[PDB]
Design an enzyme around this catalytic site. Structure first.
Site, PDB file in Angstrom:
ATOM      1  N   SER A  17       0.745  -1.144  -0.366  1.00  0.00           N
ATOM      2  CA  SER A  17       0.051   0.018  -0.089  1.00  0.00           C
ATOM      3  C   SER A  17       0.943   1.285  -0.191  1.00  0.00           C
ATOM      4  O   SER A  17       1.462   1.674  -1.076  1.00  0.00           O
ATOM      5  CB  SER A  17      -1.075   0.038   0.963  1.00  0.00           C
ATOM      6  OG  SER A  17      -2.098   1.217   1.190  1.00  0.00           O
ATOM      7  N   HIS A  61      -7.212  -5.624  -2.138  1.00  0.00           N
ATOM      8  CA  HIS A  61      -6.053  -4.988  -1.597  1.00  0.00           C
ATOM      9  C   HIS A  61      -5.035  -5.816  -0.863  1.00  0.00           C
ATOM     10  O   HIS A  61      -3.716  -5.545  -1.145  1.00  0.00           O
ATOM     11  CB  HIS A  61      -6.655  -3.705  -0.620  1.00  0.00           C
ATOM     12  CG  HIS A  61      -5.618  -2.828  -0.173  1.00  0.00           C
ATOM     13  ND1 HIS A  61      -4.725  -2.135  -1.215  1.00  0.00           N
ATOM     14  CD2 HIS A  61      -5.433  -2.190   0.996  1.00  0.00           C
ATOM     15  CE1 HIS A  61      -4.121  -1.403  -0.410  1.00  0.00           C
ATOM     16  NE2 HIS A  61      -4.509  -1.390   0.949  1.00  0.00           N
ATOM     17  N   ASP A 112      -8.127  -5.157  -6.973  1.00  0.00           N
ATOM     18  CA  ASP A 112      -8.011  -4.065  -5.756  1.00  0.00           C
ATOM     19  C   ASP A 112      -9.190  -2.986  -5.947  1.00  0.00           C
ATOM     20  O   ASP A 112      -9.337  -2.414  -6.854  1.00  0.00           O
ATOM     21  CB  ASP A 112      -6.676  -3.506  -5.784  1.00  0.00           C
ATOM     22  CG  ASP A 112      -6.326  -2.592  -4.386  1.00  0.00           C
ATOM     23  OD1 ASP A 112      -7.234  -2.138  -3.619  1.00  0.00           O
ATOM     24  OD2 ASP A 112      -5.204  -2.634  -4.074  1.00  0.00           O
TER      25      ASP A 112
END
Lengths: 811, 815
Positions: free
Chosen positions: B673, B783, B751
């Site tokens: 991330s 994600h 995602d």
């Protein structure tokens, strides 16, 4: 023996070598000069380098000592893709950008000495105008597409009108669906049938003393077709485009036929338009038909024809469709009842020639029709693989019979009720070789001398020589081009000259004009003569050592051909690493005697780094008859690599410098598919595999192609299973560096889904991959910067995992 | 010093290595205390809680006394027999309510009807609804009634009369995405991902009595209209179909959802049957009553049910308000214009929203779950406790009293209200805590207020930024903040509603997570003073894990002013003379502290597995991290990407001087991330320091991320051209290495947060700048990597990549 190793360059150093190391004329046409005294015989018009219209002059006599180079005279004042013509006026028509233009050269308004100025066709249309076609009957009318509907525009009166009202361009994709006058996705990709409307060359006269022009067109309704989401080119939006894709085993577009009628009064303006659908449903008339392969009009103009396939593509039909079959469209239910009874029963569809086969119908352009000779007959030439197993011209005469089905009855037709009887079927050619009927190859048909010219594989499958023979009493087939070269030829409409775009493996491509002679005692005989040159060669091109073409007698009883690039500056004792380019799918031959420095320039680049570049045409490739092509039916994937491995081991024995501990494979589309099949099947033979746009799963590909070669998925579950590399993920190596995947993220044809779904199973099988994505590329690679990166990663990936000693160290 | 090179295993061998290593390997939560009220009985309390054997409701018996010689383990008595994420409870009737899969079930225990000594059968609430029923909530006033969501509309169902009723008619499920897209009772994407507000409706806790003998219940609810929000396409999990699902995603700078409060008055007769349901809009638009507000951060009701409260941020998230909203502000929805006009004039001008607290900051408002309202002592005032960093720069408790004054604004007059017209005067604002340390108010951390003894229990970083601890303090005469939890472990905590017990889930760098009950006593001479006692163990520790050397928590005094912490994994069996390859793990973004005194063996297990194969593993928490105040966190405001690597390097160089076994010529970086973002920035900015960069789901381009996060830290794109450009690796592709075997992108293809187009557009520019990349896609993943087979393949392709491009001698040879 001791293994050779290649140059370990850097990334930027490889970009150096590519960056450093760095279209032909076409669409010819002949017009004679009508010149009582003067020197020049013909003036031709053709397309070449933006890419625009050229013209040239053909002299009546030449100094035969020297070689005449013809001059590229420019036809326009300032690309151009495909143009139209009308000899009776001189009226040209063509597209360039969004706009459409016209000039005049030849007919009632003279031969222009200088470049004439392009005069535009004006418009009241909000969008781009696609596919312009001239009406032959009236030289002043044209037709074109605008937002999936046909318009017509008059280039002197400046009068425009929309003919079809089908596609509502304000409404969205999901609700709309329909089209009228354009071919669908399948009919353009898999059948090369790019247009979907055809002009009538004649016009019926009215009581007021004028005319009625006619336009045929199909009406696709894509409502049941599967919606599929490709990512939009502007990745900024992060959205996807919805487009129709008939996947294998799902519904194709609801096809049906239509026709127009444009009443022109004595002055030249449109009186009133009539749009006409069929007398009955498409399901009832043309029983079991699922594709409209080709269509057009008779030179007569009395009947409009169309070649029609069944769903499995094992039943071609040629059907004649007279305009009296059509009635106007109406919402009033009982008005159409009256319109149907006033049209007769004997006016009925006419299957003039039906054929079947247990392999498949390859669709081709060839369908010459002669003028209406006898009353209820139609003489016509047609090509077919069905009879002999090889494509040959058959002169047919079908009895235009009154039908045993009368629609008045109320009953429904039996299968044979529109089948015409056959008076004869004279085979014009015969043998173990084919006539070509695709990619601009067709047949020039002399009707006074009663001859026919064609391209074919008679001398060799590797060369596309021009041939001639009579259609009346056929016999000996006279060759018209010199051996050692392959030729894509164009003959005059008056049959006296012909032009031949030609090349071979050693010398690059040229174009040459040739004069045909014929003794006055005997029309049948024809001899050529080197008349001129339209484009001189590029010579033994610098830094380019081609491959010597080899053949070998296969263990499957076929002469399998191949190209062999040898390492530049050869070292005996030191065995080299080996790379194998491949496609090996239907409709395509790689190996022929043609210049493979144009499109396959990189293969030569690999040859000048110490890679042995090999190329083979396994069973399935075109130009070698239906039985050779038909080998893999229901069995795509299963056979192809075994032919390649065999043809590789012929080169292994003869030339021992080919190291079979360093074998690489690469290809695009089907090529990448087989490249995966190679590594999956033959882990032992093949080290590395580089898959360009791989078809990893045949249930994802379209109907037209896949149902032709693999049938309907339900009746061949195993063939699909075995032919789909995505299923067989566990069979891939548990060793990295051996599997590169290359794929364009915006691919309409071989969807990126193939790659993503393959990767999904590769992940859960616990199998390594390397992957590059070219996110701005559709099917091929149509951007310089992407293409540069592809080649750059190709050569480096090979270097790091095949060629040099660092790759040998990785094991 | 001579280099170390790691042992080359094959892909097949490492898969087995990682498998065996994993050949081995959820704690309890959502605790509740209920009194047995049995003078004769041996147990004082009974605790209910959610845990795994299948995540479900258990209970234990809390004895009145213990054998203080030995440790009492508590028996996990299962309450049920048939996953339960959360549950509701009504104290008065003993009624449990909880969704479990499709169904919404209920049982009764611990109420007036007593305590069971065996499992109880879950009782389904029947339904006419076709679709799955989400977000069940017991009405606190009447435990016979419940509410739930169905197709983004609020439904209520009685669990004894079997009566069901749709309360909102906003979203029509048969119509598709674009043509509808409204909702009621539900929190939008941004409020769930960025603000952690998962519900969008709130039961009024008390019931009004009608003249006839019936009663009126009330549900405040958020009504969202997502018409103007960007419709984004992500690939459908069914790859088979080759389609893409559409959903609403407010991109940085785009339109957010358009929001408003609504109230549903449910009139119920004396039998328990719905007379009529009136749906009520606000008397004026949300735009006008709540000027400037973009997000409804949190909402609820006062204890009395007199006012609904709400916490409200403007779009910039600099201004926060706490606004009381009377039910009288809501009038029925009427199409009739003459009728509405009368209903507007029926409500007094004196009724008006009440901004009982407002605060600004030049950094940002961090939303938190601390907000406690007291009983209404004075009739035109309100007391409450609230947390804020806006005063000192550190999150502290403040006992605010606000005066509910009449507004100078009259609707009658016709004009709009001024900015200060609704703002109440603050009568007092007593600071309860203070110092250079923060109270915690997210991820279950919250206050507990002993209203009798006039105390407040809370979690905080007072003793250390690396250890969360429970504390207690008075809110009358605040002074000595007494610590309750034992030092050396970090504590997630829970306090009993009666303030006589507290449970802790604690751990440290060596010892895995243990859960213990503690009893809170007080000496008679001073009830302000509280003392704990080890009462029992709920869950015992797993014990120091086999073949897990935990890292050591280091720190250094930075040149930027702050004391940056990190973690060091030394390679196992050090060879003096040999210098090892280094792997820098990172998140290094906001709202996250990797480096603290908790057991990192569960989550960050493979950091150890790297150390066992001869890698130095470093983790640093750069300026931007949580738990060290707002000043620290604020560091990268308008500057994301620009300052983080400088901290990571400085820590790496600090370690290089103290330890020469760090081979600085072979250092790699890896993260997910924001970790992947900084991993790309490491290679783009500091080529010289970092050989390889392995970037998972990296935020490549800040305009492609959501409003709630991106604008919080970077402001509006127009207002920070440069910060966005400098903070967006996709726009600076030319600045990447021309050397291959350095850049590795990983990304989940499905995602929803960090859309794959981040990675695809980075590749677009990497291609047309002639720069090499390596890529791995995880086509079945969003994600975070969910499927175990996908996780293993990531762990495998990580170790092999590190091996071939950093660790082993084959990597060194590749130059």
């Amino acid at each position: 023996l001791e293994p050779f190793y290649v140059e370990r360059y850097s990334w930027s150093q490889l970009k150096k070598l590519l960056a450093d190391t760095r279209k032909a004329p076409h669409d010819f046409m002949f017009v004679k000069r009508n010149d009582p005294d003067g020197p020049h015989s013909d003036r031709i018009y053709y397309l070449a380098m933006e890419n625009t219209l050229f013209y040239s002059e053909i002299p009546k006599t030449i100094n035969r000592a020297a070689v005449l180079m013809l001059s590229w005279k420019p036809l326009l004042d300032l690309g151009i893709a495909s143009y139209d013509y009308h000899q009776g006026s001189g009226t040209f028509l063509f597209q360039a950008g969004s706009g459409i233009y016209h000039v005049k050269d030849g007919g009632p308004q003279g031969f222009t000495q200088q470049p004439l100025r392009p005069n535009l066709v004006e418009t009241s249309c909000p969008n781009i105008r696609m596919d312009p076609k001239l009406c032959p009957a009236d030289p002043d009318w044209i037709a074109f597409i605008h937002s999936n509907d046909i318009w017509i525009s008059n280039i002197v009166t400046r009068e425009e009108r929309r003919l079809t009202y089908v596609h509502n361009e304000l409404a969205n994709m999901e609700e709309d669906a329909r089209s009228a006058g354009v071919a669908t996705f399948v009919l353009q990709e898999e059948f090369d049938r790019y247009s979907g409307y055809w002009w009538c060359p004649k016009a019926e006269t009215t009581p007021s003393g004028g005319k009625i022009l006619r336009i045929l067109y199909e009406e696709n309704d894509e409502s049941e077709v599967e919606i599929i989401h490709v990512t939009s080119p502007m990745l900024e939006t992060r959205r996807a485009d919805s487009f129709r894709y008939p996947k294998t085993g799902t519904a194709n577009p609801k096809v049906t036929f239509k026709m127009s009628e444009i009443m022109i009064d004595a002055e030249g303006r449109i009186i009133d338009v009539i749009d006409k659908e069929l007398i009955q449903p498409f399901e009832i008339l043309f029983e079991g038909v699922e594709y409209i392969a080709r269509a057009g009009w008779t030179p007569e103009g009395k009947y409009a024809w169309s070649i029609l396939l069944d769903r499995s593509q094992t039943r071609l039909q040629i059907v004649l469709i007279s305009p009296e079959l059509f009635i106007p469209v109406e919402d009033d239910v009982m008005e159409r009842q009256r319109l149907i009874e006033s049209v007769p029963d004997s006016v009925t569809p006419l299957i003039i020639y039906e054929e079947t086969t247990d392999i498949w119908i390859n669709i081709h352009d060839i369908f010459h029709v002669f003028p209406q000779s006898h009353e209820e007959e139609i003489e016509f030439i047609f090509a077919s693989e069905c009879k002999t197993g090889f494509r040959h011209l058959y002169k047919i005469t079908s009895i235009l019979k009154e039908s045993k089905y009368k629609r008045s009855s109320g009953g429904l037709p039996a299968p044979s009720d529109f089948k015409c009887p056959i008076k004869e079927e004279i085979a014009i050619t015969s043998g173990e070789w084919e006539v070509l009927g695709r990619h601009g190859s067709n047949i020039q048909v002399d009707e006074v001398r009663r001859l026919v010219y064609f391209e074919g594989t008679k001398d060799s499958p590797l060369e596309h020589h021009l041939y001639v023979v009579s259609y009346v009493n056929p016999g000996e087939v006279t060759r018209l081009t010199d051996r050692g070269y392959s030729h894509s030829c164009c003959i005059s409409q008056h049959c006296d000259f012909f032009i031949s775009k030609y090349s071979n493996q050693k010398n690059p491509h040229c174009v040459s004009l040739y004069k045909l002679s014929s003794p006055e005692d005997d029309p049948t005989c024809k001899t050529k003569e080197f008349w001129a040159t339209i484009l001189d060669s590029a010579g033994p091109l610098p830094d380019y050592t081609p491959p010597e073409i080899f053949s070998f007698e296969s263990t499957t009883g076929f002469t399998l051909y191949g190209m062999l690039y040898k390492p530049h500056d050869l070292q005996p004792g030191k065995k080299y690493p080996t790379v194998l380019f491949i496609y090996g799918g239907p409709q395509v031959q790689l190996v022929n005697n043609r210049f493979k420095g144009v499109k396959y320039f990189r293969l030569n680049t690999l040859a000048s780094l110490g890679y042995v570049v090999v190329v083979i045409d396994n069973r399935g490739s075109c130009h070698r008859g239906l039985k050779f092509e038909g080998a893999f039916k229901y069995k795509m994937g299963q056979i192809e690599i075994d032919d390649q491995v065999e043809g590789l081991q012929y080169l292994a024995s003869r030339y021992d410098f080919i190291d079979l501990d360093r074998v690489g494979i690469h290809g695009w589309s089907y090529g990448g598919y087989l490249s995966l099949m190679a590594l999956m099947q033959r882990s032992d033979i093949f080290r590395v595999a580089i898959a360009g746009a791989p078809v990893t799963l045949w249930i994802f590909y379209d109907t037209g192609y896949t149902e032709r070669y693999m049938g309907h998925p339900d009746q061949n579950e195993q063939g699909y299973y075995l032919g789909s590399v995505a299923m067989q993920a566990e069979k891939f190596p548990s060793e990295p560096n051996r599997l590169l995947l290359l794929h364009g993220f915006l691919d309409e044809n071989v969807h990126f889904a193939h790659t993503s779904i393959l990767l999904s199973f590769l992940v859960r099988a616990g199998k390594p991959y390397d992957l590059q994505i070219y996110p701005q590329e559709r099917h091929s690679i149509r951007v310089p910067e992407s293409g540069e990166h592809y080649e750059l990663h190709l050569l480096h990936y090979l270097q790091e995992n095949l060629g040099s000693r660092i790759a040998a160290l990785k094991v």
